[PDB]
Design a protein around this ligand. Structure first.
Ligand SMILES: Nc1ncnc2c1ncn2[C@@H]1O[C@H](COP(=O)(O)OP(=O)(O)O)[C@@H](O)[C@H]1O
Ligand SMILES: Nc1ncnc2c1ncn2[C@@H]1O[C@H](COP(=O)(O)OP(=O)(O)O)[C@@H](O)[C@H]1O
Lengths: 356, 347
């Protein structure tokens, strides 16, 4: 059947909507991007830390997030000349505002009932919560999808705000984990500094020089040393965390942050899978040519290429994964990988809000 | 099939678990009550008003609420000699911590994913949200159930009172103020048999001042909660007159619930089945019988259903309705645009 995938990751660049055909295989039929309005992006970031009146605030931000999503869904369907009745379901990741697997909770907003009401399409949402309930990290969730798409020893690497890898070693459980920062700090820094939203092509970082004293200080953070099932978010790597370390030319700090993402990816990758022959890059980090060059030279044993070479545009991989999870829900097939998340075992992920 | 109903209303007395058989009819197979721990009750009440760190706090309270719930489900099933696999699904109402239909939102916590994980039974939850999305109040939800079960008025008296005219709406305070007052005063949780209220005398100046509140004058689809009727609201009214005997304020609160129920009821249907814990307030039951002399005022016990478990039964029933893809709201009770499938499935 046909599924919609609705993604809005921690970078807050915008909302991704994908349409896939699912049968034997997964095929991208169409994609649709709606940029995040500055007001909504800042209100979401404001919910990402503890604060007052969060229940009412989150409910109001939620309404706006869903209105935007449903707008995107309607535009996409009209542009593809298809009615809502041709889509089996929407896989909605929602919007994470708090991810605390050490406190056994993760909070994704995105009023799926209102999404069902606005779209006329069944919604599958709230994927991470069952994995956490079964003792897991609730992240990463893409590995089951990466395996189904690309399961030779391959690593599939997502570089969004944070980086995560899916290690596909034949005759083993799928393994994976969040490597650490992807674009999050490089975004945070060029925003604190130049007001910008990201460092295009990594050209600002390229103009700088790595500071080895800063780099080693950042690498020595406790998260990097941990092995196996691990996840992170805006809770650990953020601007106030960088400044605590900084306490030097701005461009140099930017070069150093790019290196931190390159190094924390290679070392966590090659440690867990030295035989890695192939590294498939997805997410918006795949477009950072500077970062892509550093990854190719820190893992010389493997070919470092974007998923575009293998038939999937790197920007839509995550959205495709969430549409795919709606299908898994509806077929009653497990969505997590217990050895990625550390959950007790395989679980059906999500809940169904029917259009009715 | 067999369904579990999980209810924990606004009074926070405890958690109700019911087992029903559903086919042609709805039959109560078993019930199970777990009192609310004082710690958990107070932390829930603390989430019922704006405050700091609510997302983390609500998530932690939720974990405890669901652990308790699952504990009750397991005890009940063991005691009835049945495995989780004989139950089709759990209908979970969750716990309301904020209901604001005028702001188009209602917030019921109760981590259904964790409830499914702990029980091994499919969970249907988050019933009110779709009705609110379709422009409704998201309350009351019991009228579709009352209609399937039973010119009658079916009257639930929990923290708040609602009636199903066989249309419906929340009449106003049930036990909420009488509970709030005997707790502010005597530390107690409720006024047993309404014996404290019975020992007092109604103050007509206070009563008329309370009845003149804007909510009572409104007609048709309306809902309320701890947001409107609460202790700080009563005290605001008590300040106008000088000191007044506590028992007399209690008698007056009981009268306010009796009057707001009769007048809203008889207005909308001049031509009465009592459920909820208010059915056990004999003092209130006596005043209701004398304020509506046209009708027989009896508890649902006379009609085959224990008044304490009616709401839990309603939510087990709503799980069935979800699974059969049948509407769960009554558009003319809630003011939603039309019939909707209520809830979401956590398998
Ligand atoms: N042309 C580009 N050059 C360098 N970086 C880019 C480019 N395009 C996107 N990015 C980076 O990728 C990020 C967004 O990628 P995305 O996969 O959507 O992450 P997320 O799902 O967490 O929002 C942007 O914030 C930006 O840092
Ligand atoms: N024996 C009793 N005497 C007087 N009031 C009672 C008695 N038993 C229960 N109640 C009232 O019923 C309330 C709880 O009933 P309930 O139907 O569960 O409402 P809710 O949905 O708000 O939890 C108590 O707080 C109390 O006021």
């Amino acid at each position: 059947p046909r599924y919609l995938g609705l993604m809005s990751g921690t970078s807050l660049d915008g909302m991704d909507i994908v349409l896939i055909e699912q049968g034997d295989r997964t095929t991208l039929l169409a994609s649709h991007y709606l940029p995040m309005p500055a007001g909504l992006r800042e209100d979401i970031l404001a919910l990402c830390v503890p604060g007052p009146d969060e229940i009412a605030r989150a409910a109001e931000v939620e309404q706006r997030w869903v209105a935007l999503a449903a707008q995107g869904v309607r535009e996409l369907l009209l542009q593809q000349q298809m009615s809502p009745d041709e889509v089996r379901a929407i896989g909605s990741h929602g919007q994470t505002i708090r991810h605390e697997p050490a406190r056994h909770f993760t909070v994704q907003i995105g009023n799926p009932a209102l999404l069902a009401e606005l779209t006329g399409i069944d919604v599958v949402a709230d994927f991470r919560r069952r994995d956490v309930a079964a003792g897991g990290q609730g992240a990463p969730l893409v590995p089951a999808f990466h395996q189904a798409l690309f399961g030779t020893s391959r690593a599939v690497l997502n570089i969004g705000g944070f980086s995560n890898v899916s290690l596909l070693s034949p005759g083993k459980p799928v393994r994976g984990f969040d490597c650490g920062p992807g674009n999050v700090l490089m975004d945070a820094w060029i925003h604190h500094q130049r007001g910008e939203h990201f460092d295009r092509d990594g050209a600002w970082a390229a103009s700088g020089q790595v500071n080895h004293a800063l780099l080693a200080s950042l690498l020595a953070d406790e998260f990097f040393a941990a092995r196996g099932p691990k996840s992170t978010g805006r809770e650990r790597f953020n601007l106030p965390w960088l400044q605590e370390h900084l306490a030097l030319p701005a461009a140099d700090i930017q070069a150093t942050l790019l290196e931190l993402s390159a190094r924390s990816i290679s070392e966590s990758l090659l440690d867990a899978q030295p035989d890695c022959e192939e590294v498939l890059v997805c997410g918006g980090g795949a477009f950072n040519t500077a970062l892509m060059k550093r990854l190719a030279m820190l893992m010389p044993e493997a070919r470092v290429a974007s998923t575009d070479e293998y038939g999937i545009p790197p920007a839509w991989m995550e959205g495709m994964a969430f549409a795919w999870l709606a299908h898994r829900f509806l077929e009653r097939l497990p969505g997590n990988c217990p050895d990625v998340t550390g959950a007790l075992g395989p679980r059906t992920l999500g809940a169904l809000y029917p259009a009715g």
